[PDB]
Amino acid sequence: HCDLPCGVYDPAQARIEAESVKAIQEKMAANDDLHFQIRATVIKEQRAELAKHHLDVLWSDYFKPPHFESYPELHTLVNEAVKALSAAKASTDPATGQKALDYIAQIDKIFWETKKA
């Protein structure tokens, strides 16, 4: 995942960050304090960006050309996932964070299928 290549990848990296994004949105609904809302927004932006980065790495470095042929929906799937993360950045609604997590789950399923193959 470092581009050496090192041969070590795990969608878990993107997932843990996307999980913080949703967790942050949930906490934002429980505290309307201005300063807390600013910090939560700041931090959610950073964790969603990392989640996007991790997905980007899987897309560009892990997945090889044959994988996109074997899973015709893979390009679209990863693109929708990073876009859902962009949508979560601009929202305090936990559903947006959950949507990104749902796409990550599908990508994770494909990732492991390709690992065992």
Which of residues 14, 59, 99, 111 is near its own copies by CB under 8 A?
59
CB 104 within 8 A of CB 15: yes
Q: Are 2 and 32 in contact (CB under 8 A)?
A: no
Question: Could you say whether residue 60 binds its own copies (CB under 8 A)?
Answer: yes
Please state, in angstroms and rounded to a whole number, the distance separating the CA atoms of residues 49 and 88: 10
Q: Which is nearer to its own copies, 5 or 113 (CB)?
A: 5
**2 is an interface residue for Ni ion by CB under 5 A:** yes
Task: Work out which of 14, 20, 100, 103 binds its own copies, going by CB under 8 A.
Answer: 20
| Cα distance between residue 105 and residue 90, in whole Å | 21
* Residue in this structure with the two tokens 């679209």, named with its chain if needed: 76
In the chain, what are the helix, strand and coil shares in percent, each to the nearest 5? 80, 0, 20
82 near its own copies, rule: CB under 8 A? yes
- Point out the annotated binding site for Ni(2+): 1-2, 6
Which residue ranges make up the site for its own copies (CB under 8 A)?
A: 1-8, 10, 12-13, 16, 19-20, 23-24, 27, 34-43, 45-47, 49, 52-53, 56, 59-61, 63, 65, 68, 75-76, 79-80, 82-83, 86, 89-92
